[PDB]
Amino acid sequence: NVFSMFDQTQIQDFKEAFTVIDQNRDGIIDKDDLRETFAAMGRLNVKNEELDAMIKEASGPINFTVFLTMFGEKLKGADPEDVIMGAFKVLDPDGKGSIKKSFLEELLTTQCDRFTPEEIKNMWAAFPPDVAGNVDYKNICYVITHGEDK
C-alpha cells in the first residue's frame, strides 16, 4: 500500500531527510547519527532508551529502503497536500471560503458505517480554531503534511 500513493517528490523529500540524519554519509543511520542530529537541532537531553526505541521499530540496519518502508507503513492512508485540498475543494464546490462545522460532522458520520463521534470530537480539538472559524481546510492540509505547530 506504501509504494502505491507515494510519488517521486515525496520519496526525494524522504531521501534528503535521511541524508540529513545520516551523519557519517555511510548509507545506514544508527544511534550515533540520531544523537548528533538531535544535538544539532538543540536537543542535548537525549537518553539511550529513546534512541533505542526509535531503532527497535526496524528488524535490520535502517538503510534507505528499510526507512522508506517503515515510514510508508505508518502513513498507509496519507496523501500529499494538493490531493487532500482537492477533496475539500469538491466539498467547497462554489469556491474560495471553506466549509462549516455541522456540514462535515454529518458527512463524516453519515454515508458508510462510521467516522466515529469519538474521532470527530478529537478532530475539532486537534483541528481547532481552524475547524471553528472557516473549518480552515487550507490550514488543516498544511498541519497534516507540515506538522502541528505550523
Side-chain angles (χ1 to χ4, degrees), residues 1-24 26-149:
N1 236 6
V2 155
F3 251 164
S4 286
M5 313 155 128
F6 313 94
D7 293 41
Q8 292 167 348
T9 44
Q10 297 173 51
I11 301 172
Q12 286 171 353
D13 305 353
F14 294 133
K15 292 166 185 169
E16 295 180 358
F18 303 152
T19 60
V20 159
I21 307 171
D22 268 269
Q23 290 156 16
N24 299 289
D26 299 16
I28 316 180
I29 277 165
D30 282 341
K31 296 186 183 191
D32 300 1
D33 298 84
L34 297 173
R35 290 166 190 195
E36 304 168 19
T37 50
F38 292 124
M41 301 309 279
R43 305 184 195 180
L44 307 177
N45 315 308
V46 185
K47 301 170 190 181
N48 293 292
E49 292 165 56
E50 295 146 7
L51 299 151
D52 280 59
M54 308 294 285
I55 285 188
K56 290 169 193 176
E57 298 194 338
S59 58
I62 336 180
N63 302 306
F64 303 102
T65 49
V66 174
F67 297 117
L68 286 164
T69 53
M70 299 320 299
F71 306 136
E73 282 218 66
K74 297 173 179 195
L75 295 162
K76 286 167 189 165
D79 301 315
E81 38 211 305
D82 301 305
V83 175
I84 306 171
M85 291 299 291
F88 301 136
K89 294 163 188 171
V90 168
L91 304 168
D92 295 343
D94 312 8
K96 293 185 187 183
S98 52
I99 302 140
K100 313 166 196 172
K101 35 167 35 128
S102 49
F103 293 62
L104 279 228
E105 319 191 341
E106 289 181 47
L107 296 180
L108 301 176
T109 46
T110 62
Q111 190 176 61
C112 273
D113 59 343
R114 238 177 175 206
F115 262 69
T116 98
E118 293 168 41
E119 297 183 299
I120 289 180
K121 294 178 186 179
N122 300 307
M123 286 292 295
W124 313 123
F127 292 90
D130 76 51
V131 113
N134 148 72
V135 184
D136 292 69
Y137 291 115
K138 300 183 180 182
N139 296 345
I140 286 181
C141 293
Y142 301 131
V143 159
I144 52 189
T145 61
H146 301 128
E148 309 201 81
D149 336 343

